[PDB]
Amino acid sequence: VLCDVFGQPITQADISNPTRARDERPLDTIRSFEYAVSGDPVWAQQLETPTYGFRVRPDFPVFG
Amino acid sequence: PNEPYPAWTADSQSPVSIEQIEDIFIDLTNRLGFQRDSMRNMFDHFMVLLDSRSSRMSPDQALLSLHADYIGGDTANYKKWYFAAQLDMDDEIGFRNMSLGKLSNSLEAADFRWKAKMNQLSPLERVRHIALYLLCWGEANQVRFTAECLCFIYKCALDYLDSPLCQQRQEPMPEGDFLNRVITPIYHFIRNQVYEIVDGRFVKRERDHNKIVGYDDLNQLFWYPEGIAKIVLEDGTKLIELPLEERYLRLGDVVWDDVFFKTYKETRTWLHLVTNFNRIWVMHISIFWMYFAYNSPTFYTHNYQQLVDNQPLAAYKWASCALGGTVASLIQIVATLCEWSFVPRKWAGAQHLSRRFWFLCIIFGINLGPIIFVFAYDKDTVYSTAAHVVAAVMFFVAVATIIFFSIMPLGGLFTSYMKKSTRRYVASQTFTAAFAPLHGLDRWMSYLVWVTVFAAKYSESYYFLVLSLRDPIRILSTTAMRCTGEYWWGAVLCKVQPKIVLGLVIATDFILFFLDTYLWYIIVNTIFSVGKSFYLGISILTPWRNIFTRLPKRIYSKILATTDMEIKYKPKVLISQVWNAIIISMYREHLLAIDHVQKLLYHQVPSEIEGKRTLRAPTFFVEAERRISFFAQSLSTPIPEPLPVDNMPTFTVLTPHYAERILLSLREIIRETLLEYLKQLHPVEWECFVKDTKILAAAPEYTLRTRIWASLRSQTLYRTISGFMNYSRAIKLLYRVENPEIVQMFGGNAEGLERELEKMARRKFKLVSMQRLAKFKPHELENAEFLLRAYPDLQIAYLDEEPPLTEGEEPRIYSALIDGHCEILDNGRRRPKFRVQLSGNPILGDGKSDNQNHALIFYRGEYIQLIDANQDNYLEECLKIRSVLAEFEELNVEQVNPYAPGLRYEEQTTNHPVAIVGAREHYGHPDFINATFMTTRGGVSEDIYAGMNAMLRGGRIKHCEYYQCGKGGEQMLSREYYYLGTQLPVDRFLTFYYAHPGFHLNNLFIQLSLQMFMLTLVNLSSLAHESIMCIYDRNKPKTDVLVPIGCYNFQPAVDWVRRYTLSIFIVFWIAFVPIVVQELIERIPFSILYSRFAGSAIYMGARSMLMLLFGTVAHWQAPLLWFWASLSSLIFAPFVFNPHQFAWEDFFLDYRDYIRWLSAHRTNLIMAEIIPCAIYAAGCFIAFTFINAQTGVKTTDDDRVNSVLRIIICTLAPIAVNLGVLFFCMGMSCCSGPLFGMCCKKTGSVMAGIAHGVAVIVHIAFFIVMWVLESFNFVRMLIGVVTCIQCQRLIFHCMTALMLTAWTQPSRELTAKVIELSEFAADFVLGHVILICQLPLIIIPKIDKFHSIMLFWLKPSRQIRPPIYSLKQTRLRKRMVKKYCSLYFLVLAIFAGCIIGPAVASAKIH
Ligand SMILES: [Mg+2]
């Protein structure tokens, strides 16, 4: 019954914010905030959550 | 363009991309278990900071500056904590701070290694370091108030991260682990000490303040390496015994109830006063002692007599004046003894006092010895030049000791001599002794002002002291009023009266000695401030037109940043677009009519065929007036030049809200009427509004417009919100004015230009916290949604609650953020941007601080402005925002590498940043806050405490002269006062003392001196009445007998009264001048008016009036008129200005309202305060008995007589009567309520009336028994009455003092009741005594017109008729007027009879 901006649905809800997806990375939130002001289809086509997920990108350097 | 963060993402020189910054946050959240929705918020915060700092410098410098400010720099708090705790370098830091002037395994090597390590970091490691700290800070809840605990947690987490345990672990740590394991136990410890659980609810349990561990007590544990060692686990092992990589994982097993403890305890206020300000009494009392001792040879001259003029040996004179050093050495010892009760005995730093005590007593012994040698009879009987040499040396030694103890601060007297390995300082130097020094002329001015003040004061006081007291001392100390005395004690009761009078005179002058320095300080400050004007070139003689004519050039050169632009356009076309904007802005607020507009606007009318004729200046240059005048005046002072709006930083406005009104309802408009009251206050605006209404037009829109109009003139949140939204339009106006190429390149597309301007305005300007948004009434939510519809860019924060996950467990509490662009759910609520879970209820203590704390995580930018619920702002003042932000001295400075190897600490120029900027029409209420500096050292709140904390930590405070803010005591026993008093240098200490506490001390000293003078006057008048007098003038020879044989000289005693009266009159005039200055530029029922001044110079006033009357009747002196007039004016001033008090109807309505209103070691310390009452009562009793002693007349021998038993009956009879009445009330069915319910529901009033009646009757009996002896003498009763009252007060005070430290508790209740009844009885008499004096003033019929004349001197001078009421109200009014006139006249008749009856009795009775 719940849905996000751009109409895409939601299945796993966040623990602290029940109205947001669990695996959404911060850049997607920034783009959604920008889209909320002015209607632009260009903001919706730059999402990257499903292809990468919440894990870090490959070839991320190592610290120590 | 069209990017989230243009300053960083659109630059090709950025060292790290945004996609490489997001992954660091993601990895940290995975590894440490932070909440995700807080991680998003902190990512946004960090990116906004990077965008803000990159708009005026390179990204490479921005990242390095952020790292230096947050972790590794000299301005960072983390480095200070590290060096103070881990490396144990506090003593070296204090020593370096002590000797900075001479400078400008060791501290230098440690700093070198730290800089070398910090100099070779990659940018990614810097980003990780900053991100970890921000993530830790975002979750801290109430731990944000304690910076050092957070630093310790951050260090533990950083140590755990780099270990192989974290790197080789496979699965991520479960979400929410940090908050559950680390923060919740500390929150529970904080909460469980204030509240206790009963019946399932939390109730604020009560205990003395010394058994509650506040926030400051937790913080101070993490300042020392010894405090860290006290952390213990459950199994019994210490935390520090584990290796460095495992302390984080076991941080959830610490039991905090066995660790924290109290570090500072309070006591009686006089101990704090003595300890904090020891440097002042040393420089006062020591000088007074020398002045008095040098001019009183009688007390140490062998067989002294002025007639034989035998001067004492000079050796005695020099030895006596050398005792000044001993007094100073004793004061320091006494001050050190008191300090031993403030700090724990085993806490670090407490061992300095024991070392200091031995040095102080050694100095005392050194100062004491040689004087004892000189005074010895061996060198008194035989003269020796060696004794004279010893006295001459000791004089200079004493002077040097006085100076040394008057200059050096108490904390740090003998640090360099100890050289011990133990703590050499009582308090931490890093966190409590980091004052910022002064540089330049301002440093020299501070020395010069105080040197001038003290040089003037010490030279002026001696001239008056040498002569006002030389003769009275000589006359009084040698006279002998011999008598036979009273043989129950002896003749000692009469021979010591002159010496008692002399002692009282000396005591009064000692107090008078303290009032001159404030006077001289005021005078010198005024003179220097006036003189500085000629260097500043301030001109007041110039005409206002000479200011108005220069306005456009000042606007062009100080408001616009036109220096950076190429000069393509003329100044006038730029000035016009701003002047017209301001003028039109004032018009739309209904402040100007249509005809007034064209007198001020720039016009386009003239011919366009020639380009020069295009524009013409207004005739003005060839509430609106107040604002224009202030703007024109403020543009005259020098202003820093601004930056272009594409280079300015970001700032936020923060507002708290609790139960305030958002909008006025229709009932508030049409009911009582507010609308008529507003219309008769603001007419012209009302005609303007109604005229404007029909231009565009149940009348919904008209009703809404009326609601808005009424709201804008009343105290509402909408007024404040609409006031401060002028920041956005000012920024848009400046942006479009300062570069016309962007305007031109759109070519008529207005919508695109508006969108582009709004996009720019959103970046630079940003918040209201409503803690009750989930609890509003429906009409409150209806108003709240209106604000979001009117201003889409407004943000709101509120608290939200959920039912517990597991059954029977505390509910969860969250914090949410919404704004005007959020989607509306089908429930009617808006979708939150963020939700962050808290560990519990955040509001523990009352105040706005806990409201601001939970909403502080949502701010953005670099600077914060703190406002309140009701404040106002204007468009003209918002245009100068860019110049105000330049006061922090960070916008146009050179960028350097903080980690360069060659740089030394003394060569750095950015050691002390600016923390607070406060507006004025060096403490003050803060307006603008440096966010980075303040949020890393605690919260933002309490204002004066925030100022003290910022000063102590090492920041600076400045004031802005060209900005105006639309704004519209004895608890200071704190740590801050102690730290400031015991560690500041002398000049700063004097400047601080003479501003805040010196005013209150002066107000106390004046009141004390008045009572001392009254006691001296009573005793002197008694002696003068008893003695035989002689009169003489200054034309006297050296010594000759007076015409009356055998009289006693007392004329200098009379002269002293005149001199003291003149001095006190001058002091009162100087203290009253500011009230006149404040008041003379602007031209209530009796119960509350009386209650306001009750206990404030009214009871003491009457007590002084009684003694003044006695001193007047017994003996007459001319200067007593001034005191009579002053006291009468003080008593009767408040009733003069009461509106329409002359009217009979108002008078008796007030009378009715008044009448119906009537209807361990602590043991001796808590009771040592009774002595001053005992001394005063003893003085009054001696004065009373002296007249009874019959000293003036030749006394009969061996006849005994006494009157003390009369006095004890006088004092004890009313208390016994009251106790008997209470016993009778107990006997009359106190075990059955209904009898009292049926007879008198408030039966205590009957007992109160009986007590008042018997109290009057006992005084009547006093008068009768006294006038049995005296049929024509009156002076003799008043001193006895005063003695009786003072003994009553002493008994009550001693009873209360013993009470402060079955019928056991009923005994306490009865002890309270007995003083309560006497207090009520006194108040009853005092009220009528006040009222009867005003009777003749209301009798004359002409008082009405004369009082109404004063209405013309008053500014408003507006009166409207009272609302209409029915005739029955008039009938009741006249009936009550009749009743209360009769009652008033009957009471006055009783009072008059009470006096006239004994007058007849004195004749008819024996
Ligand atoms: Mg203010």
CSV table of C-alpha atoms in Angstrom, one decimal, chain B residues 350-552:
chain,number,residue,atom,x,y,z
B,350,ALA,CA,43.6,19.5,46.1
B,351,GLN,CA,47.1,19.1,47.6
B,352,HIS,CA,48.2,22.6,46.5
B,353,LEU,CA,46.5,24.2,49.5
B,354,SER,CA,48.6,22.4,52.1
B,355,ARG,CA,51.8,23.6,50.5
B,356,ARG,CA,50.4,27.2,50.2
B,357,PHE,CA,49.4,27.3,53.9
B,358,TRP,CA,52.9,26.9,55.2
B,359,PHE,CA,54.3,29.6,53.0
B,360,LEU,CA,51.5,32.0,54.1
B,361,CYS,CA,52.1,31.3,57.8
B,362,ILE,CA,55.8,31.8,57.3
B,363,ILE,CA,55.1,35.2,55.8
B,364,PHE,CA,52.8,36.0,58.7
B,365,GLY,CA,55.4,35.1,61.2
B,366,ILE,CA,58.0,37.2,59.4
B,367,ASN,CA,55.7,40.2,59.5
B,368,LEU,CA,54.8,39.6,63.1
B,369,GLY,CA,58.2,39.0,64.8
B,370,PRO,CA,60.1,42.3,64.6
B,371,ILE,CA,57.1,44.3,65.7
B,372,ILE,CA,56.9,42.2,68.8
B,373,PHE,CA,60.6,42.9,69.3
B,374,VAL,CA,60.1,46.7,69.0
B,375,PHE,CA,57.1,46.8,71.3
B,376,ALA,CA,59.0,45.0,74.1
B,377,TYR,CA,59.7,47.1,77.2
B,378,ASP,CA,63.4,46.4,77.1
B,379,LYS,CA,63.9,48.9,74.3
B,380,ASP,CA,61.0,51.0,75.5
B,381,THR,CA,62.7,51.9,78.8
B,382,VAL,CA,66.1,52.4,77.0
B,383,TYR,CA,66.1,54.3,73.7
B,384,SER,CA,68.0,52.8,70.8
B,385,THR,CA,68.6,53.9,67.3
B,386,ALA,CA,68.5,50.3,66.3
B,387,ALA,CA,64.8,50.1,67.1
B,388,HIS,CA,64.2,53.1,64.9
B,389,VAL,CA,66.1,51.5,62.0
B,390,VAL,CA,64.0,48.3,62.6
B,391,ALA,CA,60.8,50.2,62.4
B,392,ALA,CA,61.9,52.1,59.3
B,393,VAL,CA,62.7,48.8,57.6
B,394,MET,CA,59.5,47.1,58.7
B,395,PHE,CA,57.4,50.0,57.2
B,396,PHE,CA,58.8,49.3,53.7
B,397,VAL,CA,58.5,45.5,54.2
B,398,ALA,CA,54.8,45.9,55.1
B,399,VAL,CA,54.2,48.1,52.1
B,400,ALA,CA,55.8,45.6,49.8
B,401,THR,CA,53.7,42.8,51.3
B,402,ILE,CA,50.5,44.8,50.7
B,403,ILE,CA,51.5,45.4,47.1
B,404,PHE,CA,52.4,41.8,46.5
B,405,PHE,CA,49.2,40.4,47.9
B,406,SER,CA,47.2,43.0,46.1
B,407,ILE,CA,48.6,42.2,42.6
B,408,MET,CA,49.2,38.5,42.2
B,409,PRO,CA,46.2,36.2,41.8
B,410,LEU,CA,45.4,33.6,44.5
B,411,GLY,CA,45.7,30.7,42.1
B,412,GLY,CA,49.4,30.5,41.2
B,413,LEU,CA,51.1,32.3,44.1
B,414,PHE,CA,54.1,29.9,44.7
B,415,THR,CA,54.1,27.5,41.7
B,416,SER,CA,57.7,28.0,40.6
B,417,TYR,CA,59.2,27.3,44.1
B,418,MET,CA,57.6,23.9,44.8
B,419,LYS,CA,59.1,22.0,41.8
B,420,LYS,CA,57.1,19.0,42.9
B,421,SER,CA,56.0,16.1,40.8
B,422,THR,CA,52.5,16.4,42.2
B,423,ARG,CA,49.8,18.6,40.6
B,424,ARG,CA,51.0,22.2,40.9
B,425,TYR,CA,47.6,23.8,40.1
B,426,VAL,CA,44.2,23.5,41.8
B,427,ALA,CA,42.2,23.6,38.5
B,428,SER,CA,43.0,22.3,35.0
B,429,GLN,CA,44.9,25.1,33.1
B,430,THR,CA,43.8,23.8,29.6
B,431,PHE,CA,40.1,24.0,30.2
B,432,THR,CA,39.7,26.8,32.8
B,433,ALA,CA,42.7,29.2,32.3
B,434,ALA,CA,42.8,29.9,28.5
B,435,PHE,CA,42.1,33.6,28.5
B,436,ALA,CA,42.7,35.6,25.3
B,437,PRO,CA,45.2,38.4,25.8
B,438,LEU,CA,44.9,42.0,24.7
B,439,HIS,CA,47.1,43.7,22.1
B,440,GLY,CA,47.7,47.3,21.2
B,441,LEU,CA,46.4,50.5,22.7
B,442,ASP,CA,43.5,48.7,24.5
B,443,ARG,CA,46.1,47.0,26.7
B,444,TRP,CA,47.6,50.3,27.8
B,445,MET,CA,44.2,51.9,28.4
B,446,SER,CA,43.3,49.3,30.9
B,447,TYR,CA,46.4,50.0,33.0
B,448,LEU,CA,46.0,53.8,32.7
B,449,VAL,CA,42.4,54.0,33.7
B,450,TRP,CA,42.8,51.9,36.9
B,451,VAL,CA,46.0,53.7,37.9
B,452,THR,CA,44.3,57.0,37.6
B,453,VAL,CA,41.2,55.8,39.5
B,454,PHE,CA,43.2,54.5,42.5
B,455,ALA,CA,45.6,57.4,42.5
B,456,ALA,CA,42.7,59.8,42.7
B,457,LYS,CA,40.8,57.8,45.3
B,458,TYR,CA,43.6,57.2,47.8
B,459,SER,CA,44.7,60.9,47.6
B,460,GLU,CA,41.2,62.2,48.0
B,461,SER,CA,40.1,60.0,50.9
B,462,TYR,CA,43.1,61.0,53.1
B,463,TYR,CA,42.3,64.7,53.0
B,464,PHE,CA,38.8,64.2,54.4
B,465,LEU,CA,39.9,61.5,56.9
B,466,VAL,CA,42.8,63.5,58.4
B,467,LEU,CA,40.5,66.3,59.4
B,468,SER,CA,37.0,65.0,59.8
B,469,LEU,CA,38.1,62.5,62.5
B,470,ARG,CA,41.2,64.2,64.1
B,471,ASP,CA,39.3,66.4,66.6
B,472,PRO,CA,36.3,64.1,67.4
B,473,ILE,CA,38.7,61.2,68.4
B,474,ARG,CA,40.8,63.5,70.5
B,475,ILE,CA,37.8,65.0,72.3
B,476,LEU,CA,35.9,61.8,72.8
B,477,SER,CA,38.8,59.5,73.9
B,478,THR,CA,39.8,61.8,76.8
B,479,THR,CA,36.5,63.2,78.2
B,480,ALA,CA,35.1,61.9,81.5
B,481,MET,CA,31.4,62.2,82.4
B,482,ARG,CA,31.8,61.0,85.9
B,483,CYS,CA,28.9,59.7,87.9
B,484,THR,CA,28.1,57.3,90.7
B,485,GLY,CA,26.6,54.9,88.2
B,486,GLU,CA,24.1,52.0,88.8
B,487,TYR,CA,25.4,49.7,91.5
B,488,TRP,CA,23.8,46.5,90.1
B,489,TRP,CA,26.8,46.5,87.7
B,490,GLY,CA,28.7,49.6,88.7
B,491,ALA,CA,29.6,53.0,87.2
B,492,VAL,CA,30.8,51.3,84.0
B,493,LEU,CA,27.3,51.9,82.5
B,494,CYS,CA,27.9,55.6,82.2
B,495,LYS,CA,31.6,56.2,81.9
B,496,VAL,CA,31.9,54.4,78.6
B,497,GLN,CA,29.2,56.2,76.6
B,498,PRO,CA,31.6,58.6,74.8
B,499,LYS,CA,33.9,55.7,73.9
B,500,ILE,CA,31.0,53.7,72.5
B,501,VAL,CA,30.0,56.8,70.4
B,502,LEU,CA,33.5,57.0,69.2
B,503,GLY,CA,33.6,53.4,68.2
B,504,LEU,CA,30.3,53.8,66.3
B,505,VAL,CA,31.7,56.8,64.5
B,506,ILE,CA,34.8,54.9,63.4
B,507,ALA,CA,32.6,51.9,62.3
B,508,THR,CA,30.4,54.2,60.2
B,509,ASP,CA,33.4,55.8,58.5
B,510,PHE,CA,34.9,52.4,57.8
B,511,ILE,CA,31.8,51.6,55.7
B,512,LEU,CA,31.8,55.0,54.1
B,513,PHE,CA,35.4,54.2,53.0
B,514,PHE,CA,34.0,51.7,50.5
B,515,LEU,CA,31.7,54.0,48.5
B,516,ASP,CA,34.3,56.3,47.0
B,517,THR,CA,35.9,54.0,44.5
B,518,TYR,CA,32.7,53.4,42.6
B,519,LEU,CA,32.2,57.1,42.3
B,520,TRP,CA,35.7,57.7,41.0
B,521,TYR,CA,35.4,54.7,38.6
B,522,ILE,CA,32.2,56.3,37.1
B,523,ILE,CA,33.8,59.7,36.8
B,524,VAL,CA,37.0,58.5,35.1
B,525,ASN,CA,35.1,56.2,32.7
B,526,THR,CA,32.9,59.2,31.7
B,527,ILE,CA,35.9,61.5,31.2
B,528,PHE,CA,37.8,58.9,29.1
B,529,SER,CA,34.7,58.1,27.0
B,530,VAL,CA,34.1,61.8,26.3
B,531,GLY,CA,37.8,62.3,25.5
B,532,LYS,CA,38.0,59.4,23.1
B,533,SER,CA,35.4,61.2,20.9
B,534,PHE,CA,37.9,63.7,19.7
B,535,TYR,CA,40.2,60.9,18.5
B,536,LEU,CA,37.2,59.2,16.9
B,537,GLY,CA,36.1,62.5,15.4
B,538,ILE,CA,32.5,62.2,16.4
B,539,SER,CA,30.5,65.3,15.3
B,540,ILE,CA,27.1,66.1,16.9
B,541,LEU,CA,26.9,69.8,15.9
B,542,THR,CA,26.5,68.9,12.2
B,543,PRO,CA,23.0,69.3,10.8
B,544,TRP,CA,20.8,66.3,9.9
B,545,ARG,CA,20.7,67.5,6.3
B,546,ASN,CA,24.4,67.1,6.1
B,547,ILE,CA,23.8,63.5,6.9
B,548,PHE,CA,20.9,62.9,4.5
B,549,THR,CA,22.7,64.6,1.6
B,550,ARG,CA,25.6,62.1,1.7
B,551,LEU,CA,23.3,59.0,1.8
B,552,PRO,CA,23.5,57.7,-1.8
